[PDB]
Design a protein around this ligand. Structure first.
Ligand SMILES: Nc1nc2c(c(=O)[nH]1)N[C@H]1C(S)=C(S)[C@@H](COP(=O)(O)OP(=O)(O)OC[C@H]3O[C@@H](n4cnc5c(=O)[nH]c(N)nc54)[C@H](O)[C@@H]3O)O[C@H]1N2
Ligand SMILES: Nc1nc2c(c(=O)[nH]1)N[C@H]1C(S)=C(S)[C@@H](COP(=O)(O)OP(=O)(O)OC[C@H]3O[C@@H](n4cnc5c(=O)[nH]c(N)nc54)[C@H](O)[C@@H]3O)O[C@H]1N2
Ligand code: F3S
Ligand code: FES
Ligand SMILES: [Mo+4]
Ligand SMILES: [O]
Lengths: 133, 842
């Protein structure tokens, strides 16, 4: 009956679990949709926490669904299949690549105890025709 | 970053109507299907309620066929009714194997949708300049005006007063139906000489050199790139510009995935994973991807000095010939053995402007081209060792003495590069010498631009060299201009001067039209003609959007593009497919072939009314009601093997189509030709290929050496992966324009520091030809002194700083451009959200 997708508000981690510039594996909006939380050390688009620097992304390439690797030196996600590069410091913008989407980014919220919740996604996740299956 | 916030898509139902679609865009011609179904219906996640027969309530795995991105979904009109459409890549098509580039995969979202508000810039109605501005009207009105002015000018001044600019290519905005209709109008009904093509300012071939040598430029198959020992990729950025050919055919070679197939097809010789030579002054993402796939030891990037390919190729040919690393049997049996005399003005000039190079035997070409390694190292800037290594990777026999198989592919770095005729011939010399034409793993081919879809009446009347149309226009000649599917304001050479004059001449006619009464049509036509006589120009644009040159035009006629019509074209291995119509043209838009027919009908009517019944009768033979009629009058009757091909037969072959030329039809299958020249009989009167005696003579085009000597930077230019052409569609695509609101100019970061520039700064590029703007993009891989600006782009046109310089056959030498750079503005706020990171995968 509902006009929009109903996203669940799922706890992913606590801010205390994150180290600067090291992705933490998560899954949202369900266990079959891999992604990461990443603390970048600088305030950025979609970034939450005291420093506005914590972001969440799908890490499945929106072109053909290959898992992305993170380059800590460049702070980029990188696709070994067809050479795509995504910039988590700029909303997941595809720097160069084959996808017609920038990287699906989580709408995050930090509770008073430091718990990080995801409550939406801003693009269609690879391999599902509805973000909430 | 741009995000669509589309959280879910309608599911294609199991009974959706399926249509075969070739990609609208590049040469590769990837196969797709368009699935349509009624607006008030939809599929479900259960296997029986969707086209894939799979359970879509579960996450799909990598490379699933049972998914599509939002850019592949839209709602469009089909037979007057809104339908859902999905346009998704064909897993079974051998070209792409289910891959869709960043361009093809947005066909649906760049389609016209009134329901979803995509591409609302699309033209819907004829427009005429009257009452002070552009105004919409009927076809009958607009066509009548075009024909009356055209007919009067041609009757009073000759057909030479009609100037034409038109596509000659395939895919969307071209194709066999559309090239035939425009060709029949201008070359059968008329004998227009002052015609130019979409990408070059005269009616020439891009590759006269290879053609005159007897080697048609599309001679191999894509499988050849999988089978070669060495790929030699000259002036191509194939990952960005021939994407799915590179990914689906070259990459498997370099990775060693094709080794099994190589050993199966060619068991009597050794095979290792492919090596690749890349001849490009710039280190591109293509170079990077090759290194990452094959390893750096199997990639030779020859980062030549801009415009020095000919010196390289001649040194390669010399070295390979001197070592005897040549296919002696091929040379003796299939190439010209005749002695020939060099022309009197050789080596600086050919026999005439028609013939810039000297066609000869192997032996004579070697002696004529002869260049030492050391001399070529000096000219090209390469190390002697690099040139020797390349010669070995091309010519050196494999273990057991077996001939090394090499596919030579080239594109616009050569074609729009220095001394097109000689450079092209010098590369073909390598392929001919090594017997790498007409055999597996070989070829010397264009990698291509658009698809191909040319069939036209004879162009013998245009001459060789043909007229330099832009120079006629700039010099105040011609009276009427018909423009079909091209936008010189964004993509011609010497574009700044072109725009200045074009505006002034069209303004003369605008000012006359505004002051004359339209409802007295004869008075309007007379006022137009009077302004033409004073040096004005009446201009008609046929297009799908409001173009930049269209801002200067007096009449705009709306076209329908691929998918809104049936269309046929072939790809870079001559694979001919039918794109089946899946939607309606916007508004009153019409296929180009039918616009040409309606214009011919109007000309016949108008000329009859004027009393010139004999000229009128030349415009018969345009009774077409649908594009298939143009297919049948053109391709079916004129192409080699044409009689075997029909829409119905093409449709049955699907997205795999067949390879041209057709040789028969049996058991519901058009039979085709996998490779050309497999019998060693070439496209010349005696069946032998010619070599070319093509000596280095520096920067050939006028003014180039002086432009280089008098300006600080190389302004290299070309494509970006994400942008299609002059961004005619992309300018209303937020995904594209959010990435690059301005064209980038790649700059070395030290060059940037020296010039006081930061990332995102808006800069002016300027020289003797003109000035333009671009956004500085720090590019660590750029060489000092060498920049690369995105071409064709509406928010800063690179062509403004290209000189008028061409070769003798009027080929535009865009790639050899130098200029100065100065800041216009600190980085605008509208680029604050951009990533300026490296485009190279890590
Ligand atoms: N400096 C420099 N300049 C270059 C080049 C370069 O390397 N450097 N490259 C050159 C090359 S290779 C090319 S191909 C040219 C491209 O130059 P153009 O052909 O001028 O550029 P496009 O953007 O391909 O223009 C296509 C036009 O056709 C319209 N169109 C699309 N489909 C249809 C259709 O079905 N019917 C009609 N009637 N119109 C339609 C589009 O809206 C657009 O206005 O640029 C050339 N210019
Ligand atoms: N993404 C995308 N792909 C497209 C198109 C597009 O608009 N967008 N357009 C299509 C069209 S119409 C065409 S014509 C093709 C163009 O395909 P390409 O020719 O592959 O593309 P370009 O970017 O024009 O130029 C290729 C390379 O030539 C190099 N180059 C510059 N000067 C020289 C020189 O003197 N010698 C050598 N050897 N190389 C030189 C440049 O550094 C550049 O990397 O791409 C087609 N594919
Ligand atoms: S998707 Fe289209 S743009 Fe070229 S690489 Fe394939 S034909
Ligand atoms: S699957 Fe990531 S670039 Fe194609
Ligand atoms: Mo082109
Ligand atoms: O092209």
């Amino acid at each position: 009956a509902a006009a929009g997708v109903e996203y669940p508000a799922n706890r992913l981690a606590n801010i205390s679990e994150l180290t600067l510039n090291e992705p933490l594996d998560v899954a949202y909006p369900d266990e079959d949709a891999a992604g990461v939380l990443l603390k970048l050390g600088t305030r950025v688009e979609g970034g939450v926490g005291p420093d506005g620097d914590i972001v969440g992304f799908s890490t499945i390439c929106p072109h053909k669904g290959c898992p992305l690797s993170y380059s800590a030196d460049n702070k980029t996600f990188n696709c070994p299949c067809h050479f795509s590069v995504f910039d988590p410091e700029k909303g997941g913008q595809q720097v160069w690549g084959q996808a017609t989407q920038n990287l699906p980014q989580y709408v995050l919220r930090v509770a008073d105890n430091g718990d990080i919740f995801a409550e939406g996604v801003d693009e269609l996740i690879y391999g599902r025709l509805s973000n909430v299956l | 970053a741009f995000k669509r916030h589309i959280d879910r898509l309608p599911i294609i139902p199991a009974d959706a109507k399926k249509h075969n679609v070739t990609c609208h865009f590049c040469i590769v011609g990837c196969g797709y299907h368009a699935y349509t179904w009624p607006i008030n219906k939809q599929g479900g996640t259960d296997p029986q309620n969707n086209i894939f027969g799979v359970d879509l309530s579960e996450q799909q795995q990598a490379e699933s066929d049972a998914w599509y991105s939002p850019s592949m979904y839209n709602v469009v009109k089909q037979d007057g009714r809104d339908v859902h459409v999905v346009i998704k890549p064909d897993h079974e098509c051998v070209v792409n194997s289910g891959l869709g580039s960043v361009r093809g995969a947005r066909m649906a979202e760049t389609s016209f949708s009134e329901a979803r508000n995509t591409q609302q810039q699309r033209l819907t109605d004829p427009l005429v300049w009257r009452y002070g501005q552009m105004q919409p009207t009927s076809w009958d009105d607009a066509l009548d005006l075009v024909a009356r002015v055209t007919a009067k000018i041609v009757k009073e001044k000759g057909e030479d007063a009609l100037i034409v600019s038109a596509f000659d290519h395939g895919g969307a905005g071209g194709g066999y139906e559309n090239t035939w209709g425009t060709g029949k109008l201008y070359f059968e009904a008329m004998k227009v000489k002052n015609i130019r093509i979409h990408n070059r300012p005269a009616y020439n071939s891009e590759v006269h050199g290879t053609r005159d040598m007897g080697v048609g430029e599309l001679n191999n198959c894509y499988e050849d790139a999988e089978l070669a020992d060495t790929i030699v990729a000259v002036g191509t950025n194939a990952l960005e510009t021939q994407t799915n050919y590179f990914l689906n055919h070259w990459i498997p070679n370099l990775r060693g995935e094709s080794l099994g197939k190589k050993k199966e097809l060619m068991p009597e010789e050794p095979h290792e994973a492919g090596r690749i030579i890349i001849v490009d002054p710039r280190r591109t993402v293509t170079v990077n991807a090759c290194e990452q796939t094959a390893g750096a030891d199997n990639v030779l990037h020859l980062a030549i000095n801009s415009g020095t390919d000919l010196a390289l190729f001649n040194a390669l040919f010399t070295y390979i010939a001197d070592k005897g690393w040549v296919d002696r049997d091929f040379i003796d049996k299939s190439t010209l053995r005749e002695g020939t005399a060099r022309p009197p003005l050789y080596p600086a000039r050919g026999v005439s402007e028609a013939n810039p190079g000297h066609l000869s035997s192997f032996e004579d070409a070697v002696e004529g081209c002869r260049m030492s390694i050391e001399e070529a190292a000096e000219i090209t800037g390469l190390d002697a060792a690099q040139i020797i290594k390349a010669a070995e990777w091309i010519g050196m026999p494999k273990e057991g003495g077996k001939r090394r198989r090499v596919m030579f592919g080239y594109e616009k770095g050569l074609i729009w590069g220095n001394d097109n005729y000689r450079t092209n011939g010098a590369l073909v010399n390598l392929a001919l010498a090594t017997g790498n034409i007409g055999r597996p793993g070989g070829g010397v081919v264009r990698l291509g631009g658009h698809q191909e879809g040319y069939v036209r009446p004879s162009d013998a009347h245009v001459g060789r060299p043909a007229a330099y149309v832009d120079q006629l226009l700039i010099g105040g000649q011609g009276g009427v201009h018909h423009i079909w599917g091209c936008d010189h304001y964004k993509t011609t050479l010497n574009a700044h001067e072109f725009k200045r004059v074009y505006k002034k001449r069209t303004d003369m006619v605008k000012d006359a039209m505004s002051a004359a009464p339209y409802g007295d049509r004869e008075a309007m036509v007379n006022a137009i003609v009077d302004a033409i006589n004073q040096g004005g120009l009446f201009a008609v644009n046929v297009d799908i959007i409001p173009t930049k040159i269209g801002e200067a035009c007096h009449v705009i006629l709306p076209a329908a593009t691929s998918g809104e019509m049936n269309l046929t074209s072939m790809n870079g291995e001559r694979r001919m497919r039918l794109t089946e119509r899946y939607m309606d043209p916007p508004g009153q838009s019409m296929p180009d072939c039918l616009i040409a027919a309606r214009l011919a009908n109007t000309m016949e009517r108008v000329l009859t009314e004027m009393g010139d019944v004999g000229y009128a009768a030349q415009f018969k033979g345009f009774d077409w009601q649908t594009e298939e009629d143009a297919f049948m009058d053109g391709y079916n009757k004129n192409a080699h093997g044409g009689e075997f091909v029909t829409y119905e037969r093409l449709s049955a072959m699907g997205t795999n189509g067949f390879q041209e030329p057709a040789t028969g039809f049996t058991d519901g299958k058009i039979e085709g030709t996998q490779r050309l020249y497999t019998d060693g009989v070439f496209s010349t009167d005696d069946g032998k290929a010619r070599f070319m005696d093509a000596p280095w003579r520096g920067l050939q085009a006028p003014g180039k050496q002086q432009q280089k000597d008098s300006h600080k930077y190389l302004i290299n230019n070309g494509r970006a992966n994400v942008v299609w052409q002059s961004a005619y569609l992309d300018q209303e695509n937020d995904f594209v324009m959010d990435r690059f609101p301005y064209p980038f100019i790649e700059m070395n970061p030290e060059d940037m520091a020296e010039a006081g520039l930061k990332e995102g700064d808006l800069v002016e590029i300027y020289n003797d030809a003109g000035a333009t703007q671009a956004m500085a993009y720090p590019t660590p891989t750029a060489r000092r002194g060498e920049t690369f600006m995105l071409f064709g782009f509406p928010t800063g046109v690179q062509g403004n700083v290209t000189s008028a310089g061409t070769n003798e056959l009027i080929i535009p030498n865009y790639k050899q451009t130098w200029g100065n750079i100065r800041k216009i503005s600190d980085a605008p706020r509208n680029v604050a959200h951009l990533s300026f990171k490296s485009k190279e995968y890590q």
